[PDB]
Amino acid sequence: NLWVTVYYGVPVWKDAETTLFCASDAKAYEHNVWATHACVPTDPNPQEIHLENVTEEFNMWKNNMVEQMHTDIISLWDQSLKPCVKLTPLCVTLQCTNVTNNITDDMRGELKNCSFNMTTELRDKRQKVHALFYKLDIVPINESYRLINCNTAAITQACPKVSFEPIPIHYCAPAGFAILKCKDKKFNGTGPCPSVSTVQCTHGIKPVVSTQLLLNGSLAEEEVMIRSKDIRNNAKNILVQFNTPVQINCTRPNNNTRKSIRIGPGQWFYATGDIIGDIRQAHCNVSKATWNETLGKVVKQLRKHFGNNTIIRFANSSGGDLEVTTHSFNCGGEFFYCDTSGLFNSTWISNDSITLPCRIKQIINMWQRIGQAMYAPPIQGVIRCVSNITGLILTRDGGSTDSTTETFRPSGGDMRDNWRSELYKYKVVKIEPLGVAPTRCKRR
Amino acid sequence: NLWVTVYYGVPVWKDAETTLFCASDAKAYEHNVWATHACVPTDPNPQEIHLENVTEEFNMWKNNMVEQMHTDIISLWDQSLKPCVKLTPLCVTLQCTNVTNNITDDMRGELKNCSFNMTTELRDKRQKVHALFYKLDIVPINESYRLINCNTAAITQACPKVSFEPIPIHYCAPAGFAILKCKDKKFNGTGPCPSVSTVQCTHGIKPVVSTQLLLNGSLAEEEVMIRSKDIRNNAKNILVQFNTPVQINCTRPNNNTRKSIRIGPGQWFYATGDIIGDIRQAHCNVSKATWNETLGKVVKQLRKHFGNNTIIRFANSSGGDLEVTTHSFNCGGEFFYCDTSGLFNSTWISNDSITLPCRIKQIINMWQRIGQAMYAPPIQGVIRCVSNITGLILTRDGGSTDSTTETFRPSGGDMRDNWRSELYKYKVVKIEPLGVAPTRCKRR
Amino acid sequence: NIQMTQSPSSLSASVGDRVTITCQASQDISNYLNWYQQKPGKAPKLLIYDASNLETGVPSRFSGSGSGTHFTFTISRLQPEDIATYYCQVYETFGQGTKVEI
Amino acid sequence: VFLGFLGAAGSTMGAASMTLTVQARNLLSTVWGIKQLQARVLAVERYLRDQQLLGIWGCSGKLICCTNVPWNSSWSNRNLSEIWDNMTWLQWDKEISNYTQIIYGLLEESQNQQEKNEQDLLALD
Amino acid sequence: VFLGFLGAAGSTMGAASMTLTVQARNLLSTVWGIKQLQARVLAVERYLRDQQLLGIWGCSGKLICCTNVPWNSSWSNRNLSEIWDNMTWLQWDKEISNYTQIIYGLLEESQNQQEKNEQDLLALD
Amino acid sequence: VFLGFLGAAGSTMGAASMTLTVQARNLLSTVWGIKQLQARVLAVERYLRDQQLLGIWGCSGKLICCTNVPWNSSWSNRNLSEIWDNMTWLQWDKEISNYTQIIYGLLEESQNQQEKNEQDLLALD
Ligand SMILES: *[C@@H]1O[C@H](CO)[C@@H](O[C@@H]2O[C@H](CO)[C@@H](O[C@@H]3O[C@H](CO[C@H]4O[C@H](CO)[C@@H](O)[C@H](O)[C@@H]4O)[C@@H](O)[C@H](O[C@H]4O[C@H](CO)[C@@H](O)[C@H](O[C@H]5O[C@H](CO)[C@@H](O)[C@H](O)[C@@H]5O)[C@@H]4O)[C@@H]3O)[C@H](O)[C@H]2NC(C)=O)[C@H](O)[C@H]1NC(C)=O
Ligand SMILES: *[C@@H]1O[C@H](CO)[C@@H](O[C@@H]2O[C@H](CO)[C@@H](O[C@@H]3O[C@H](CO[C@H]4O[C@H](CO)[C@@H](O)[C@H](O)[C@@H]4O)[C@@H](O)[C@H](O[C@H]4O[C@H](CO)[C@@H](O)[C@H](O[C@H]5O[C@H](CO)[C@@H](O)[C@H](O)[C@@H]5O)[C@@H]4O)[C@@H]3O)[C@H](O)[C@H]2NC(C)=O)[C@H](O)[C@H]1NC(C)=O
Ligand SMILES: *[C@@H]1O[C@H](CO)[C@@H](O[C@@H]2O[C@H](CO)[C@@H](O[C@@H]3O[C@H](CO)[C@@H](O)[C@H](O)[C@@H]3O)[C@H](O)[C@H]2NC(C)=O)[C@H](O)[C@H]1NC(C)=O
Ligand SMILES: *[C@@H]1O[C@H](CO)[C@@H](O[C@@H]2O[C@H](CO)[C@@H](O[C@@H]3O[C@H](CO)[C@@H](O)[C@H](O)[C@@H]3O)[C@H](O)[C@H]2NC(C)=O)[C@H](O)[C@H]1NC(C)=O
Ligand SMILES: *[C@@H]1O[C@H](CO)[C@@H](O[C@@H]2O[C@H](CO)[C@@H](O[C@@H]3O[C@H](CO)[C@@H](O)[C@H](O)[C@@H]3O)[C@H](O)[C@H]2NC(C)=O)[C@H](O)[C@H]1NC(C)=O
Ligand SMILES: *[C@@H]1O[C@H](CO)[C@@H](O[C@@H]2O[C@H](CO)[C@@H](O[C@@H]3O[C@H](CO)[C@@H](O)[C@H](O)[C@@H]3O)[C@H](O)[C@H]2NC(C)=O)[C@H](O)[C@H]1NC(C)=O
Ligand SMILES: *[C@@H]1O[C@H](CO)[C@@H](O[C@@H]2O[C@H](CO)[C@@H](O[C@@H]3O[C@H](CO)[C@@H](O)[C@H](O)[C@@H]3O)[C@H](O)[C@H]2NC(C)=O)[C@H](O)[C@H]1NC(C)=O
Ligand SMILES: *[C@@H]1O[C@H](CO)[C@@H](O[C@@H]2O[C@H](CO)[C@@H](O[C@@H]3O[C@H](CO)[C@@H](O)[C@H](O)[C@@H]3O)[C@H](O)[C@H]2NC(C)=O)[C@H](O)[C@H]1NC(C)=O
Ligand SMILES: *[C@@H]1O[C@H](CO)[C@@H](O[C@@H]2O[C@H](CO)[C@@H](O[C@@H]3O[C@H](CO)[C@@H](O)[C@H](O)[C@@H]3O)[C@H](O)[C@H]2NC(C)=O)[C@H](O)[C@H]1NC(C)=O
Ligand SMILES: *[C@@H]1O[C@H](CO)[C@@H](O[C@@H]2O[C@H](CO)[C@@H](O)[C@H](O)[C@H]2NC(C)=O)[C@H](O)[C@H]1NC(C)=O
Ligand SMILES: *[C@@H]1O[C@H](CO)[C@@H](O[C@@H]2O[C@H](CO)[C@@H](O)[C@H](O)[C@H]2NC(C)=O)[C@H](O)[C@H]1NC(C)=O
Ligand SMILES: *[C@@H]1O[C@H](CO)[C@@H](O[C@@H]2O[C@H](CO)[C@@H](O)[C@H](O)[C@H]2NC(C)=O)[C@H](O)[C@H]1NC(C)=O
Ligand SMILES: *[C@@H]1O[C@H](CO)[C@@H](O[C@@H]2O[C@H](CO)[C@@H](O)[C@H](O)[C@H]2NC(C)=O)[C@H](O)[C@H]1NC(C)=O
Ligand SMILES: *[C@@H]1O[C@H](CO)[C@@H](O)[C@H](O)[C@H]1NC(C)=O
Ligand SMILES: *[C@@H]1O[C@H](CO)[C@@H](O)[C@H](O)[C@H]1NC(C)=O
Ligand SMILES: *[C@@H]1O[C@H](CO)[C@@H](O)[C@H](O)[C@H]1NC(C)=O
Ligand SMILES: *[C@@H]1O[C@H](CO)[C@@H](O)[C@H](O)[C@H]1NC(C)=O
Ligand SMILES: *[C@@H]1O[C@H](CO)[C@@H](O)[C@H](O)[C@H]1NC(C)=O
Ligand SMILES: *[C@@H]1O[C@H](CO)[C@@H](O)[C@H](O)[C@H]1NC(C)=O
Ligand SMILES: *[C@@H]1O[C@H](CO)[C@@H](O)[C@H](O)[C@H]1NC(C)=O
Prior knowledge:
This is part of a larger assembly, with 2 copies of chain A, 1 copy of chain C and 3 copies of chain D. By secondary structure, chain A is mainly beta. In chain A, 10% of the residues lie in helices and 39% in strands. Chain A contains 4 helices and 33 strands. Chain A is globular, with a radius of gyration of 26 Å. In chain A, 41% of the residues are buried. Chain C is an all-beta fold. In chain C, the strands form 2 sheets. In chain C, strands 3, 4, 5, 8, 9 and 10 form a 6-stranded antiparallel β-sheet that branches. In chain C, strands 1-2-7-6 form a 4-stranded antiparallel β-sheet, with no helix packed on it. In chain C, a hairpin with a 3-residue loop joins strand 4 and strand 5. Chain C starts with a strand and ends with a strand. By secondary structure, chain D is mainly alpha-helical. Classes of the chains: A mainly beta, C mainly beta, D mainly alpha. The interface between A and B is medium-sized, with 10 and 17 residues. The complex binds a molecule of 6 linked components (NAG-NAG-BMA-MAN-MAN-MAN) (2 copies), a molecule of 3 linked components (NAG-NAG-BMA) (7 copies), a molecule of 2 linked components (NAG-NAG) (4 copies) and 2-acetamido-2-deoxy-beta-D-glucopyranose (NAG) (7 copies). The site of a molecule of 6 linked components (NAG-NAG-BMA-MAN-MAN-MAN) has 13 residues of chain A, from strand 30.
């Protein structure tokens, strides 16, 4: 009656994990932290096929593309930092005084003028040099100063030519694998997606390294989206995706120099040196009204999970490192750490601009590795910066004695959640082209 | 009537670029700058098939094999220099005097006896050592001397065991690719070649690094060959291939020592130290008559392009570095720079030996990289050397006010033209084995 | 070396009409002839390279065609931004130059 | 090449069986260089494993191959209409994955092996 | 192995069609180790792409395969003598490369696909 | 997969010819990563060389393939019983390895090539 028939090319897939190569246009330059050793050129025709009558189970919280991106970004940081100047002769005693230049009261003590002995191109001669160092980079040797990492880690200067500006990268699957995109606009990243397509590569994802705020990310199409591995678990971060972005205006007003010091036979140390004009605090402005309407939308969407009559409180971070207690980020080449206590300070009952002070740092341990730190060279001129706040990473306060109110604070640190906000709609699947089915046909 | 028929194995090819592996006999030794990490053993039976009734378009000036050889040779130099002694403790003040030994008037000031403090195997002890350094390696610290690269680059000693003698390398294509050889004996490297063959690998090409003169290269079969990307463009180098070679006799008459200085726990610095006997200038002899007949042939072939009645003038190089202003080369392990002003000094109207003084250098930046230099250790004894001048790299003088005369000067520096002289007759092609053609046959 | 003759030596034309400048080389030079524009008090600006290709950022009204010995530069419309001296060039040699005029 | 890839994934199995070549053409194309090379090599050997499975049956160089293995109603008791006009290949794979290895074993146990041996013997008479 | 490789490249297409195996046998065989491995892997997947193209037509395991695609005089209007006795395969490729993709599309569009489906159906009666 | 691998290595050739699929399934699956990748790539291209050899004969997608090459008694003058019932495949390979290349040359010289050309011509009448 019926016989086994073998079909090859059958459209069937399974869940699997694989290594995804990265496509990138990579135009310009004639010096990129990422697309120079790992990724490859883009695709002129990005082809997306809508899989009709297809409902597919997605899970952004068990997506191996996020882990692959984490490993790739860390490794690419390390590779970019490998061929640069090692700053081991700068772990010496530093004689430091306060800056005599005109300094605002807020910036008093933040910057130190430090004189020290350094190596020259000739190993038998020493030079007396001086440099400006931020107070967050400088530890007193006793109750004479020293850099912060000298006790724990060796320091490597970042190559000034290499730029820290994120460029989009598309994650593409090899042959025999596919990337399924969830096209549902209300999708919270877990469960069945009815509107599915297949793509060669993901969209252009900028590897933006930041805490407490998702800058230059994608925007929700319809409404603010609240996503969490377990919304009832306070230990799990809450990813908030905006539908309209909030512009953020960051700047370091100091007109800065870059003094070159020949530390070795061909090695250069780029210190700050001097500031032309007045000295003022670096800061970030956001619109008060825009932030108000965005927080109102976030509260409206949080009340879906936490009840309609509950009071939603926004408070600043409870504690941690400077990376997680502040909106830490990097644009213009310098590393900002901005106090978001003015962003999150509200109580929403169920019924102009904000200026965030920012502190700059030059010694950074980005991924908390042991025995490795980076010196960020100073940038010549005045650095300004404009970005779209497109989301938040929040943490709900646990152990609440009062059941009527819920408190949410900024969070971050683990950047796997920064790119979970981008890779939530993608899923790697594995084509099983061989099928067997009954047909009336019989081999002779 | 007619039907599509599919043929596989069709002899059709296209122009393409690929990575070519290198075959080499690699006999001897029980320490080669090239065939130790990159290339592989040779082929007992070099098989060449003449492609009859085949006319193929060649272009030596857009040959990717030349670029591949450039990258391979640079990378192989770097790899050979990686596992050797870094000479960073030799960038110190050097107290230098003239050499008290019997010195000829030509060699007065060329060599300096320099005393300096050096590290020992124990880091807490220093040694007073002295070494002989050529004047071209030594810069005065002020208007006390220093090596030349201390301001700009770190220096690495070349491993004395590793020899700089070129060995032939054959460039072979992978599967699905072929190397077509142009067998025409009058071919100028561009245009259709009627006599074509196919080979597994190129001929044995010695990677000879030199300027202004092609040493140990291939010889033209019939006549002196003038080749240029554009013979009317003065900015394009003219490659001259000889039909009969000119022997060149090079020597450094100094009987030299190699003093070993333990600079580190297991690191050794090999200085010159002392000279046994008289001191004389290094030099290269060529036969005056042989050079005369070769230059007459070159003039005869240049007049084909530049007119029959024009005056062909040979003048020395207009300027540049010591690499390009002199015949720079390396045989015996030491780096010679020979004044070819006696080679090129003539005026040819349309109708004994020459001795070239040579200066030796030990600090060499071969490929003008940034932050990298090499120290060439001295060679024990008297180095002599015999080579075949098999060609020239010339540059025509532009903007000539006088239309009756043309002036040609030595050129070089870009070694991609040194191996363009060898890879001019080869072309990588890409087999397209699948064809479709009409036949009367019809599938059942 | 390669002598050049560029004509017309001086040209005056009203807006809208086409301007055809001709460069004649002293021998076969393949397609290696370039056309530059030089406004007064400014450096020359390359419009045509290799006698047919158009430099990026140049309006399409500029065009060039030629080979061997003879080359032609065509400006279809004498728009007011275009008043400048136009030069042909082969290798080291620059043409004598022609100045359009309104 | 990529056009229509998996487009019939939600089609019926009968309708998705007319698009097998779009999904068959798409199975063949520093540390990250090693990663890309590992991906390419894995794809190649996977494709070759599938082709070997097809070839040890009578299904070499075929995207649809009829066999001599009878269908057992212990694997699926649906009639052809439910399979080829009401169900998709993903649902069918979910339903039949528990017996797939038994079916493969039967495909290479007796039918192709005894067929080949019988054709060895029929080429004697 | 390498003997006679491309030796009939200048022969007529008819005469070069008797030497297809010399050109078919020759398509299958630190940082430089990675370079050689990339070359080998590329050759392998290229060969497999060509074999897949042959197999999605009826031309699996064949160096000469007759098809059911008629020849269109819009691709070439020469008579068999000009093609197989006066022209070489390189000249033919230069002449026919503009239509090659149309021919490949026709080879896998209807003839092998409808043939296979019709053989699926002829194995019922 | 690995079960029974080479288990019939000491069997007679006739008896070991019923187990060809266990030995056919087993031919397809930092510096040490490069070593493993080189091993995998070598296995792949070796398998493809063997399949190409089978395909340039009439033996594509077949583990047993009858040919049109007569047996020469200069290669072995044993009768079928001594070969298929008294000898093993290892002993046979030791005996016949000196002529293997002649046999391969004859397999691809005339039989498959002239057969294919004759089937090209028989598809005309
Ligand atoms: C979110 O996304 C936003 C949009 O992408 C980002 O904002 C962008 O931030 C980048 C990085 O700071 C900005 O890029 C800079 O832009 C300037 C040049 O662009 C234009 O600027 C001028 C007017 O503003 C204009 O005249 C120019 O012609 C140009 O159009 C410069 O600040 C800067 O250029 C510098 O870029 C090189 C790499 O940084 C640098 O090497 C060069 O300077 C160095 O070298 C030269 C030559 O050797 C020397 O002369 C210099 O002294 C120095 O040594 C060069 O000057 C850079 O390109 C970008 O403009 C900005 N976009 C917008 C729309 O604002 C955010 O940063 C993102 N946010 C986060 C958190 O990632
Ligand atoms: C163009 O092409 C030309 C032909 O190839 C090149 O000329 C060649 O140049 C090379 C390199 O200088 C010459 O090779 C040298 O030849 C000598 C040995 O060969 C013969 O010499 C003796 C007679 O001359 C004879 O008795 C010998 O038995 C032998 O047959 C030596 O100068 C030298 O040998 C040295 O080679 C090792 C690598 O250089 C070296 O390590 C050895 O010495 C070191 O080690 C030993 C043992 O540890 C110690 O005892 C030593 O003190 C020292 O530490 C060894 O001595 C080398 O092989 C070649 O002969 C020459 N050929 C011709 C025909 O002239 C040109 O150079 C090419 N031109 C260019 C520009 O590239
Ligand atoms: C950090 O402190 C250093 C000193 O350690 C400051 O630089 C020094 O400042 C003095 C006083 O301004 C300079 O002296 C002056 O120099 C000018 C010429 O440059 C001369 O005209 C004046 O008469 C006077 O001598 C001195 O040169 C300079 N450098 C040194 C090595 O002493 C530096 O400005 C301080 N930076 C900040 C931001 O406060
Ligand atoms: C973030 O917002 C703050 C607060 O509005 C901005 O500071 C304001 O910046 C303007 C423009 O520079 C200042 O105006 C100028 O001030 C000085 C002193 O009078 C003088 O140079 C000029 O006459 C002019 O008035 C303004 O005073 C200043 N206000 C305050 C309260 O600091 C800041 O620029 C914004 N930063 C961004 C967008 O990066
Ligand atoms: C470069 O200069 C050094 C000195 O810095 C020269 O070596 C030194 O030369 C002196 C005088 O010849 C040596 O003194 C003599 O030593 C011998 C024994 O070796 C002894 O018999 C004599 O009575 C006399 O003392 C000295 O030892 C030697 N070394 C040092 C460290 O001083 C060297 O020769 C010079 N090189 C050249 C090429 O000119
Ligand atoms: C390159 O050519 C020059 C010039 O012909 C050669 O120099 C000559 O070399 C010979 C052999 O060494 C010298 O003869 C010897 O000279 C001294 C002083 O009389 C002495 O040791 C012996 O009695 C013998 O005569 C000759 O003087 C010398 N001539 C000149 C003008 O320097 C040189 O050797 C050649 N170099 C090569 C082939 O590498
Ligand atoms: C997604 O599933 C739906 C069913 O839920 C599929 O809809 C079917 O689409 C076909 C092709 O367009 C329709 O056939 C056409 O129908 C009418 C008669 O109704 C006739 O005018 C045409 O001759 C043609 O056959 C069919 O009616 C329709 N069936 C429904 C809605 O029940 C749809 O194809 C699936 N889409 C995919 C897999 O992309
Ligand atoms: C290169 O092209 C030439 C034609 O331009 C080809 O020459 C032809 O070669 C064949 C085979 O050797 C000759 O066939 C022989 O001819 C004579 C009668 O002329 C007869 O004695 C033999 O029975 C045999 O068939 C043929 O005549 C000759 N034709 C010419 C010169 O017109 C040559 O084969 C090509 N070579 C290649 C592709 O290697
Ligand atoms: C190793 O070699 C021995 C021979 O030296 C092989 O022994 C043979 O094994 C077969 C299969 O078990 C026996 O067949 C059976 O024999 C009896 C009649 O004797 C009958 O009851 C059964 O119908 C069956 O056919 C065979 O007799 C025996 N022959 C001998 C000992 O001469 C053995 O198979 C080899 N083992 C391997 C390759 O694993
Ligand atoms: C942040 O910077 C942007 C520009 O990068 C500012 O946008 C401009 O705002 C001014 C003042 O209202 C307008 O006149 C301009 O038209 C705006 N656009 C541009 C392109 O300049 C924006 O105002 C800044 N936002 C702040 C300080 O809240
Ligand atoms: C900040 O956000 C705005 C709004 O999303 C961005 O402007 C959009 O840019 C996209 C780029 O594809 C365009 O398609 C939209 O039309 C733009 N929208 C508007 C309203 O202009 C803007 O580029 C973002 N800026 C940064 C620095 O990321
Ligand atoms: C360059 O050196 C070669 C040998 O390497 C010399 O050739 C010898 O020359 C002498 C003197 O005329 C002859 O007796 C020998 O027979 C030649 N051959 C050999 C193998 O020694 C050559 O003369 C030198 N050329 C110069 C100095 O111009
Ligand atoms: C210098 O050139 C001569 C002439 O080309 C070389 O001698 C030839 O060497 C080849 C090597 O294959 C032989 O086939 C020729 O018979 C030789 N010719 C003569 C006339 O002897 C010589 O080897 C070259 N020397 C160097 C050092 O490269
Ligand atoms: C220098 O700054 C420190 C804070 O870093 C402050 O305590 C001290 O009083 C200052 N000294 C001065 C202005 O002399
Ligand atoms: C996400 O949406 C699914 C339905 O698609 C729902 O079952 C699940 O509970 C949602 N997750 C949260 C945290 O609300
Ligand atoms: C040492 O040599 C220099 C040239 O390098 C010369 O000017 C000086 O006079 C010499 N001194 C002596 C011989 O004392
Ligand atoms: C090279 O030869 C070709 C003909 O084969 C000719 O057209 C071309 O002009 C020649 N090149 C030069 C620079 O003379
Ligand atoms: C079908 O499968 C059952 C076990 O599920 C088995 O016992 C039976 O024999 C099989 N039928 C056929 C016809 O092979
Ligand atoms: C041949 O090609 C033309 C277009 O060039 C097309 O219109 C025509 O239908 C084709 N003929 C056949 C028989 O397929
Ligand atoms: C068998 O081999 C011999 C050489 O050993 C050869 O001469 C003979 O012709 C061959 N026989 C056949 C039938 O091919």
